[PDB]
Symmetry: C2
């Protein structure tokens, strides 16, 4: 008690030094995120144009696509294996590690690797997001400033590493709330207190978001329009859908993990059979980007189209299966790139389909399939990485259908609920667990 | 250590099945409780407004019945608290904050009836007070009461079920489920050590109570503001400036609440008779003003839409601000059962509007609309006195749904907290607990 009183009166006083530094961090992460984001676009572009000039005939071009993505894949798989192996896959597991002080931040290596790395895997049209990359790139930026300014302390090492990963997510999805929420719900050391300063993370998020806005305003990443509302007599349906995502979250967790192992064999850890295999997956993606594009790519492309109930039943299920596959390959293959976006895409597609069925089971509800899409869009994020608060808010800032806030809060929650009563676990933590264990062994 | 981590990591996100289901029962009751209160407060304002109409001819007889009604209700409310439950005075957020620190008892057998019927009286009578304060505390106690009835044991349950009560408490208060959760995990919680509070459990509670609220209030909001215009990039600095204003004002407003709290203790010296009489006068004043100048009484929800829309004169906004500062201090410092959270939205709004006004005519090349500044400012004083920026920001978003105003809102609050921090302001919740918590030793 007597101590507490002493603390209360002392609460919320973050050293201006950390504060001013939080600003620069975000600013950097922002610009960087912008820079990443422009690069990827550029590469998807040339792949487009080089098919234009070789429009024929089937094969001349089914192949130039394959190569282009294969050749970009390999550049990426190589850049990781050779100079920064810890910059493979997501980036989140890693940085979560760093927040525990159970991994290091080799920023002078990771920056170039991930960035020019992802530039390749992303740009070549692989099933993988910007999120991992930029969240990772983000902490490293935050680290690089700690180093350059000889900042020392736990708080300061913890906070600056923290803000760059928030401001890295912020600038990735243009979601400044979800940026902050992620740190305080997931990223952070999960089992003990931490000296992360909220006030600082905000500032970073702000500044990187602004940077994103200075170069991407005048277009949302996802347009969905304002969907219909949701009658109270309609809510149980959102619980059901949550329950499905609740069983499937863990199952998809198994496969992501398992598929990592079953993919380690095809090179046994060997930099050459890896870069060549990744080169093959990459090639597969740049092919699919042209013969079935909904199955390949990041998949933001198909959220709008799914939400508008534009796919038939068949095309939805196909896309879902097809993506369950390609997502596994691209992520489990250790290639640098997040699984966050492609999960949004799975949740969306799943959502719609679930909707479609309800629409015709109950014309009395005047349902629109599209509201189940938006409920499900974050539901996978909720069942598999288990950080629902962050997914719910991620979709919120991203779709602006605030009136669906109950259905979305319910679907998400009923996913995190069955994902716990089927024994799944935070896929981000299952991955950090994997790393740390195959290390003291 | 690395081996415990891997141990712990693999074990994450398992909340005991009992704890979850009991957070559901908590959520459900917190919501119904909130709705019941919500209605009881409405009915009173109504009887009151209609008694003035049995007497809408004889002006002095009218100015009398207005006053007396609020007086009779204020007194009854102060009384209940002074007589059966001192902890149910003022907001209730500081107290529930105490209980999370295990520094303050949750005497739910006492507070539930005193806070509920107490607030019913003070809110009912027209006094400048909120629901949040009271429903969050009632929320908490409802949680404790289910903990006790079911004797769920051990740290997780006592904090979780106390925390879900508080968040289901706030959610139904403003129909803001996300706000309630972000309130617990940013502000309510023990600020300096880890805690065994289940997030997922707080969620279930929130969902339940928000649904109870919706069953009784679907259709109308609490605040309708429509979809205001966007903020262009070149405009953002004005929100930062506005932030800095909320930032220096923030702390200063905390000082007067504390100051006033003292000076008000003098008038009754702590006497249960001078108190109940002093409350009856402040209350009676409010029910009067709630006629002659309604903008200066009431909780503040009514004038939000009016100010945001730009239907007030710069003259009237200055007037409202002064007057409400005075009625807000006078009611809350006085330690009537009631919160200061809602009134803070109002003062925040009015100021933002007024800023916007001046901002509009200084920069036509911006094509401003003073009403974006009202929204930015509505959550800014909760940022600069309560220091719950994330909670205010999200509460406002939930309430006025102008998502495209998100940056200017963030910047405003974040600017306000920064000036509030650097100028020496103290989280008004924390600073109120600290006094309560200290005086309990001091008296020794």
């Amino acid at each position: 008690r007597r101590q507490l009183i002493r603390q209360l009166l002392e609460r919320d006083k973050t050293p201006l030094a950390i504060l001013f530094m939080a600003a620069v961090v975000g600013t950097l992460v922002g610009l960087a995120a912008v820079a990443f984001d422009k690069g990827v676009a550029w590469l998807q572009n040339q792949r487009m144009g080089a098919l234009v000039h070789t429009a024929d005939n089937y094969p001349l071009l089914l192949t130039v696509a394959f190569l282009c993505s294969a050749v970009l894949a390999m550049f990426g798989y190589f850049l990781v294996r050779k100079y920064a192996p810890e910059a493979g896959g997501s980036g989140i597991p890693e940085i979560e590690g760093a927040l525990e002080d159970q991994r290091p931040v080799r920023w002078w290596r990771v920056l170039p690797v991930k960035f020019f790395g992802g530039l390749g895997t992303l740009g070549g049209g692989m099933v993988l997001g910007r999120a991992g990359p930029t969240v990772q790139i983000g902490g490293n930026i935050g680290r690089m400033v700690l180093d350059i300014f000889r900042l020392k302390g736990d708080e300061a090492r913890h906070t600056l590493l923290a803000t760059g990963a928030a401001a890295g997510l912020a600038a990735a999805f243009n979601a400044p709330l979800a940026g902050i929420l992620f740190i305080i719900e997931e990223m952070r050391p999960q089992f003990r207190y931490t000296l992360i300063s909220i006030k600082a993370v905000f500032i970073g998020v702000i500044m990187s978001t602004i940077m994103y806005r200075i170069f991407n305003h005048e277009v949302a990443l996802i347009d969905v329009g304002k969907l219909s509302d949701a009658p109270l007599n309609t809510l149980w349906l959102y619980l059901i859908l949550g329950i499905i995502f609740g069983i499937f979250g863990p199952i998809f967790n198994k496969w992501v993990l398992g598929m990592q192992d079953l993919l380690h064999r095809v090179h046994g850890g060997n930099i050459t059979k890896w870069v060549l295999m990744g080169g093959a997956i990459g090639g597969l993606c740049g092919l699919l980007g042209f013969v079935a594009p909904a199955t390949s790519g990041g998949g933001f492309n198909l959220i709008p189209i799914a939400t508008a109930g534009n796919f038939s039943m068949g095309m939805l299920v196909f896309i879902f299966v097809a993506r369950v596959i390609t997502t596994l390959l691209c992520f489990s293959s250790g290639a640098p790139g997040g699984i966050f976006a492609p999960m949004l895409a799975l949740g969306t597609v799943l959502g719609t389909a679930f909707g479609m069925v309800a629409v015709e089971l109950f014309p009395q509800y005047h349902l629109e399939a599209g509201t189940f899409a938006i409920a499900g869009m974050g539901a996978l994020l909720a069942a598999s990485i288990r950080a629902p608060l962050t997914g719910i808010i991620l979709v919120l800032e991203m779709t602006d259908n605030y009136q669906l806030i109950l259905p979305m809060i319910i679907t998400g929650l009923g996913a995190t609920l069955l994902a716990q009563f089927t024994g799944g676990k935070p896929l981000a933590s299952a991955i950090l667990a994997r790393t740390l264990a195959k290390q003291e062994a």
